[PDB]
Design a protein around this ligand. Structure first.
Ligand SMILES: *C(=O)[C@@H](NC(=O)/C(=N\OC)c1csc(N)n1)[C@@H]1N=C(C(=O)O)C(=C)CS1
Ligand SMILES: [Cl-]
Ligand SMILES: [Cl-]
Length: 247
């Protein structure tokens, strides 16, 4: 039996969205205290397309099924020149995550297939578990939906190696999620940018590792133009600095 204190709403974080002329939600979860915090409980439970944050469960499935042998396997560029320059090269799992190389993961989903992708997302309890649409694009313009609170629930299982895949797969994905590390904290996260279906939003989901605690975070915000993509991390870090989680 699970016991859960409700999400505590801290509307003071809205000032961080307001200062940057933005609208969105930040959700934090204190792992030690088992307490959750958000600036907008309604938007915290609102489900959106995961977009590139789906690279986290997609990596886990591709690794557990042998589609990706390890983080060193090179996926050669198919020769198609695309709009984002860093996509037009060879990649491994580490660089495909860092630069958010969609075509690499579309090939992953095709090899996984509809049957295994559906069964794996159900085992993950991931969002609405709906892969309706193209097998290689559902997370970009299909039926899958996930909320910021559901993202944190999925990430907590990943951190504790509790997802129903091999521990090795989860360790490799958590290594590929490495974003920032210094003497004060470690950040393992994944960005996201949904544009094929309104509303256009940006994601940032992950956790902050401290010496004594882990703070899980999941944010999304309105993103009418790609000019404010950096606000996904800037606003999240402003909330973390206000809560004295990072210096
Ligand atoms: C994943 O989120 C992915 N985003 C996209 O492919 C885009 N739309 O998907 C619905 C996209 C890229 S540019 C545009 N106008 N729409 C990669 N995500 C990120 C990210 O930082 O989140 C990127 C910037 C590279 S594209
Ligand atoms: Cl993707
Ligand atoms: Cl690491």
């Amino acid at each position: 039996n699970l016991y859960f204190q409700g999400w505590q709403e801290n509307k003071s974080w809205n000032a961080h969205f307001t200062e940057h002329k933005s609208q969105g939600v930040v959700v934090l979860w204190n792992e030690n205290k088992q307490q959750g915090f958000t600036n907008n409980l309604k938007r915290a439970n609102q489900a959106f397309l995961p977009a590139s944050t789906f690279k986290i469960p997609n990596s886990l499935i591709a690794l557990d099924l042998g589609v990706v042998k390890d983080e060193h396997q090179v996926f050669k560029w198919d020769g198609q020149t695309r709009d984002i320059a860093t996509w037009n090269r060879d990649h491994n799992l580490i660089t495909a995550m860092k630069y958010s190389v969609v075509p690499v993961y579309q090939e992953f989903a095709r090899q996984i297939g509809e049957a295994r992708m559906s069964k794996m997302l159900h085992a993950f309890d991931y969002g609405n578990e709906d892969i309706s649409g193209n097998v290689d694009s559902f997370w970009l313009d299909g039926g899958i939906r996930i909320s910021a609170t559901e993202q944190i629930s999925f990430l907590r299982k990943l951190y504790h190696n509790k997802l129903h895949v091999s521990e090795r797969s989860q360790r490799i994905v958590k290594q590929a999620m490495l974003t920032e590390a210094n003497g004060d904290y470690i950040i393992r996260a994944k960005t996201g940018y949904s544009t094929r279906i309104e509303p256009k939003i940006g994601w940032w989901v992950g956790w902050v590792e401290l010496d004594d605690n882990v703070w899980f975070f999941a944010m999304n915000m309105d993103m009418p133009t790609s000019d404010g993509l950096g606000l996904r991390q800037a606003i999240t870090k402003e909330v973390l600095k206000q809560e004295k989680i990072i210096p």
